[PDB]
Amino acid sequence: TGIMTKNQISSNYYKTVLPYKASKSRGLVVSNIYSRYDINELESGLMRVSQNKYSPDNYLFQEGQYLDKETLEKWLDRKSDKNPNGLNPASNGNGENRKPIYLAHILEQDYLKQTDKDTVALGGISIALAMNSVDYYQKEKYGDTYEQPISDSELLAQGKEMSATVLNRIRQTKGLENVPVTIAIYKQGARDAVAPGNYIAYATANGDSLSNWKDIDEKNYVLPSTESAKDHKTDNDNFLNFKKAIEDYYPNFTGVVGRGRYEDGQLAELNIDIPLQFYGEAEIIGFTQYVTDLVGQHIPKTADLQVNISTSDGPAALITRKANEDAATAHIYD
Template sequence: MKKIAVLLSVFMLILSACAPKFEKEEEIVQQTDNKQQKAIIPKYNISDSYYRTILPFSPGEARGLVVENLNTRLDVAEFESGLMRIAQERFSPKDYLFQEGQYLNKKTVESWLKRKLTKEQLKEKKMDESENVGLNPMMSDEGTNEEKNKKSPIYLAHIMEHDYLVKNNDEKVQLGGVVIGLAMNSVHYYETEEGYPREVEIEQEVIEREGKRIAAEVLSRLRKIKGLKEVPITIALFKQQPATSIIPGHFFAVTHVDQGSSSIDDWEEVNEQYYLFPSDEAEENHRDDMMKFLNFKSDIDEFFPNYTGVIGRAFYRDDQLQQLTINITMQFYGEAEVIGFTQYVTGLVMEHFPDYINVNVYISSASGPESLIIRKANEEQPFVHIYQ
């Protein structure tokens, strides 16, 4: 009865806290080159860590390519959300508005992602050197397809642009900075002449070297685009995971280029990493955190015989655990069992994991999502939702 009362109080808190306070939007003028247009800034912001988006919404010119070019849905989500996280170091959500990239269109991104063509290929395609804009290494004409791919793998998987807008002294909104994400392959996939799938693992040292080389060329090209000659530009390098991975990749380096500069002076290390719980890698590098997870998992195993799986995805920044996402798959036989199990797991979350980390628990069955538990860092009460 005590657990039910606690859960009901949590639900009441959620209902009262989650009702948004709607305020009148702010009407402004957006300055784009020599053009001006009316726009709206939403007053309500769901979190201080999220950027407000200027309205009407302007889709990015290369929208949708990220899904085609990255290996997994996890990489797609982390590449975009992580790029926003990096942007906050230079462009505060309090002062800047977010807009999808408006300068790199689909055709440009697709052409930059190609291999650089050889002189023979240019001649065959009747193209001149100015059109030879591929950022990935050219493929040699000699050797088997396997030999050529091993020697010259595809390094750059995707380019993403985010624009950040800011008010000027005339209360007009204009471009205040650009953030570019370069997604680098950790594995290059290809086929032999006979059509057999093959892969080449790319060493971290090579990924870093090629990423920084490509970043310098991208910066040079950006400065030649109308509207980007003077704005501050941030470029971040992302290492995507193999296609079989169940954890996302991570950013590993970032550079901030000052207004008007066309050169990269230095790079900063981005110390981020995802770990799978349980795994040998997590046990070796973060044993204490994984033991907390294993004790949590053990308590579920002991009291619920229908248990089928508990998997954790831990996000570390500067070697400190920031967020733990747990997926639990169960076989349920009724609504009462879902409620009882969710109550029990909520208690375990509060008991096993320190309050300085964010914990998200997704409980599902063969029928789909069953319930959700979110415990934000330093909050006494979790958010609990049972799907109807």
């Protein structure tokens, strides 16, 4: 056991245990999840789900230590006599009644509680099953890449079934026999998706069986877009005004795009991307000052806000404002 970090950074995060323990499946998520935006959603979102049961006021976070790379890779593979623990369906051809890869990845997070001066004990674990919304496959090397769409209902049904199997195994895993297990089902977006996927449900096992599944209303939108105009017109309009204001004084900077994460239909976090070509540093400074004014005037202060102004060579400026905070803060990279 031991201490932890002292800076939390954000309430959505837990303090992390030290000495640092690196994931026993470190990096697997990068090879299994195509989009970095799905990766962020998966890991950040599972911390969000954990906060329903484990307060960051009282619990510490550690990357998954109990399920290792090799074990996770066996579970992620198709079932088979040579891979009996595989969670995905056994192959029955690449044709029509084909059985897809439903499961792309399994994420483990450990939640520890400090019990005295120098000791922390495991208070619970969270698991995410990252499900495919589109399964990509080839019928031969160098062949075309085919897509099999999977509905929310089918991926939800498969996820619930696999989650049962996963819980039973954790229960048979040394040092996890007792710990409450929280499992969440994540829907990965398509590879060419304009926005990442989202969590869809979760359940908790205090004992030997999962509770009823609770639905999660989480969705990511691009701003501006027809979908945003439709479901969140006010956010879309505000964003369009923000954009137009930028272009009124900076006509060619038209790449302004927003990535809005919604929970229960309310904007929780808006990431505004502004990719630029570099023409000089004063240009960046003045632009960032102006955008900082514009977020004050156009962007609702009920969501966490990040404006990433960057060039090909890296970040140029950052503007941030926390939910319910009046003033944005800007930094010019040096």
